[PDB]
Design an enzyme around this catalytic site. Structure first.
Site, PDB file in Angstrom:
ATOM      1  N   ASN A 194     -10.340  -0.163  -0.882  1.00  0.00           N
ATOM      2  CA  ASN A 194      -9.033  -0.007  -0.847  1.00  0.00           C
ATOM      3  C   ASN A 194      -8.314  -0.692  -2.123  1.00  0.00           C
ATOM      4  O   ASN A 194      -8.182  -1.983  -2.290  1.00  0.00           O
ATOM      5  CB  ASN A 194      -8.270  -0.490   0.405  1.00  0.00           C
ATOM      6  CG  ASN A 194      -6.863  -0.585   0.437  1.00  0.00           C
ATOM      7  OD1 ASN A 194      -6.206  -0.177  -0.401  1.00  0.00           O
ATOM      8  ND2 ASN A 194      -6.346  -1.099   1.654  1.00  0.00           N
ATOM      9  N   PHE A 219     -10.158  -4.564   0.221  1.00  0.00           N
ATOM     10  CA  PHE A 219      -9.537  -4.754  -1.129  1.00  0.00           C
ATOM     11  C   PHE A 219     -10.383  -4.520  -2.320  1.00  0.00           C
ATOM     12  O   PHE A 219     -11.367  -5.356  -2.784  1.00  0.00           O
ATOM     13  CB  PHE A 219      -8.619  -6.080  -1.287  1.00  0.00           C
ATOM     14  CG  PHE A 219      -7.460  -5.898  -0.340  1.00  0.00           C
ATOM     15  CD1 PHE A 219      -6.615  -4.529  -0.365  1.00  0.00           C
ATOM     16  CD2 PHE A 219      -7.303  -6.880   0.529  1.00  0.00           C
ATOM     17  CE1 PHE A 219      -5.700  -4.552   0.859  1.00  0.00           C
ATOM     18  CE2 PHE A 219      -6.095  -6.884   1.423  1.00  0.00           C
ATOM     19  CZ  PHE A 219      -5.174  -5.675   1.632  1.00  0.00           C
ATOM     20  N   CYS A 240       1.053  -1.403   0.128  1.00  0.00           N
ATOM     21  CA  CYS A 240      -0.027  -0.052   0.089  1.00  0.00           C
ATOM     22  C   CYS A 240       0.650   1.153   0.083  1.00  0.00           C
ATOM     23  O   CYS A 240       0.232   2.457  -0.097  1.00  0.00           O
ATOM     24  CB  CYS A 240      -0.931   0.024   1.107  1.00  0.00           C
ATOM     25  SG  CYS A 240      -2.130  -1.203   0.920  1.00  0.00           S
TER      26      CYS A 240
END
Ligand code: NI
Lengths: 399, 403
Positions: free
Chosen positions: B347, B226, B175
């Site tokens: 995300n 995700f 990330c």
């Protein structure tokens, strides 16, 4: 901004933080290889024994032939009898085995990198705290956090070191880490970059098979090794000494080379598939690619330059040498590494550059480039990418 | 220059104190930003039904109820996925908890990552308005699979970039890579006169998707956050008047591994794909250290309050946003762009923060703000990930015409 017990109340358009002035320079080089030495002459015996392939004499004769013409005398491996016997999956052809390979590689790569780095830092002679960036490449496994942080931790570098990790790039990464280090060093005043390449064969090792000839070539050429280079612009008088200056870094994908070299990380580890004539493609295109750069510094002949070429194998060296009609000694450093270490993937070309410096020293040459002022460091690999840096070698005192 | 070319071995600019090839003069600037997401839209409200159905976990009602509570409080309204019922049914191993499946995942991700990256890149190139041949470097990151040649070359081929484009590929970073590609682009752009860098982050979930497990709750959380997405940024120094327009200038890029954060986030690429293990309170560690890490830079630009700066923070879940916001005493509007992205896309790993920066620019435009930083001149773009690494870039937003 605080001052004593009070306060006071930067750069609008221009840059807030300054860049360096001179070209990035190689300030030191270090290297390391595992302890286990394997003689190429009898490597087939060990290889076919540990992989339970003794009932395959024809294939063994084929592998022996490949080893005999490899131009390799010995290789160093972390892998040995004990480790392989404890990981039978790795001794098969394609049985599921990534997890055990990763366990080995994730630990060995940073360890070998740390040793190479310490050797470079020792030659450099400066506190490791002055290292501002770490740039690393490896094709031996992947993890999160990456191998560069694992290495920085083993070395005890500052917590705020700026990192660049380049996993799974292949044989051309030796040049890549230097190209990346060049910009990092030149664009940041005071920056000192630790550039590293560390490779181990845990992820590619596997039993020989007539259904995978490319695997036979790899098992005969690939060895273990790590190399580290300290890169920085504006060397400080007295405490630092430039060996080479980096003046150009570029690369290119060769025409009609799509699919030449494919590397797949699978459930069975890393598997390579070759589809075209790599030596041929490189030999046919290398001249044109290098010509423009040579012209930048007025070099007219290929022989007025020194060479640090990735020893991918004996074929590439022989054909390029012939194509450019180079004097026999031009590629000797590359052949010395191939002979003593085999193909250590990305770290190989860095070993070659160190060897060029070594030969210059032992042969009483006028520069660190065996007497030549300018030279090329060349790496190649997947996509059929050729990476190159134009180096200027500093003067070397003679007897 | 040849200078007549009579003595090329001596008239070139290469020496111990000068360079053969010139570097740029001004700070690297963001000249354009583009993004892309796959077509399949999955509403977060009912994702639990689909997820437990496809993973054959309906016999775990308690675990499902737990997953539903996580999805309901995730700050996410929807996510975009390449994966759908058909693809997952064609890859049963991927619908299990830990059965061998890497080869299935790799086949999917190897093709999808560059495709999505190409779309994002084309959008950035279109905004930029220059010939794609002017792109001299391509810097890319992804945590979705690995291949040789890499995704950056695959993307360059799809885009038709020059054969001699300089490349930097950073696989399996996590990330914080959104900030990473920009930090790398900064040096490449500033150190090479005329350089125009295409910085990319492309993420797909084929490698991390897997069945829920009562023994892997941090993993269950990941399954709720995700999503897929790609972002591309064109970076270059010394913008050419009339044909290029700077949006943000990069003036500092740094990073650090937080104290006592070992093992905070571990990502293992296994025979069953990528598995994450969060052993420490990630938002807590970041909140406790972020202030001291940025303090000196903040004072350097003359800001005394954290509210004097604009922000583009990796939306790694809602908690990091809530906690840092409270710690730095930021007004609610400061992290709104980050929350907007988490809300609309979830995300998307490394690409997330780049979506946020584009959103900051968009909000500035739609709200008649005086700069591309929603009214503020200086700002921080922040990414975080494994090794509990925090990456940050100090950006200067250019003035924006007001009505
Ligand atoms: Ni004072």
């Amino acid at each position: 901004m605080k001052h004593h017990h009070h306060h006071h109340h930067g750069s609008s358009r221009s840059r807030l933080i300054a860049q360096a002035v001179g070209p990035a320079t190689v300030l030191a080089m270090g290297k390391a290889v595992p302890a286990n030495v394997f003689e190429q002459a009898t490597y087939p015996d060990f290889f076919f024994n540990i992989t339970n392939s003794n009932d395959k004499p024809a294939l063994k004769a084929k592998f022996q032939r490949i080893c005999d013409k490899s131009g390799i005398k010995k290789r160093h491996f972390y892998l040995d009898q004990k480790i392989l016997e404890s990981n039978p999956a790795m001794c098969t052809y394609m049985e599921t085995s990534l997890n055990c390979r990763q366990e080995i590689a994730v630990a060995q790569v940073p360890k070998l990198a740390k040793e190479a780095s310490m050797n470079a830092i020792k030659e450099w002679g400066r506190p490791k705290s002055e290292i501002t960036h770490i740039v690393m490449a490896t094709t031996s496994g992947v993890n999160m956090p990456g191998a560069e942080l694992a290495t920085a931790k083993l070395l005890g570098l500052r917590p705020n070191v700026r990192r660049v990790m380049m996993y799974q790039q292949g044989c051309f990464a030796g040049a890549t880490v230097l190209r990346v280090a060049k910009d990092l060093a030149e664009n940041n005043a005071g920056a000192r970059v630790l550039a590293i390449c560390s490779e181990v064969t845990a992820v590619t090792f596997r039993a020989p098979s007539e259904t995978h000839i490319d695997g036979l070539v790899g098992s005969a050429l690939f060895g273990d090794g790590a190399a580290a280079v300290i890169v920085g612009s504006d060397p400080r008088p007295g405490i630092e000494r430039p060996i080479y200056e980096m003046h150009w870094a570029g690369e290119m994908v060769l025409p009609e080379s799509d699919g030449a070299i494919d590397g797949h990380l699978t459930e069975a580890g890393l598997v390579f598939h070759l589809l075209k004539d790599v030596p041929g493609l490189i030999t046919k295109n290398i001249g044109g690619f290098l010509k423009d750069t040579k012209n930048l510094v007025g070099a007219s002949s290929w022989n007025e330059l020194f060479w640090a070429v990735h020893p991918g194998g004996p074929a590439i060296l022989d054909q390029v040498e012939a194509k450019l009609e180079l004097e026999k000694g031009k590629f000797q450093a590359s052949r010395d590494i191939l002979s003593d270490y085999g193909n250590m993937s990305s770290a190989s070309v860095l070993f070659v550059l160190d060897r060029v410096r070594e030969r210059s020293l032992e042969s009483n040459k006028s520069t660190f480039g065996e007497g030549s002022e300018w030279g090329f460091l060349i790496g190649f690999g997947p996509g059929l990418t050729v990476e190159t840096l134009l180096l200027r070698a500093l003067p070397l005192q003679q007897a």
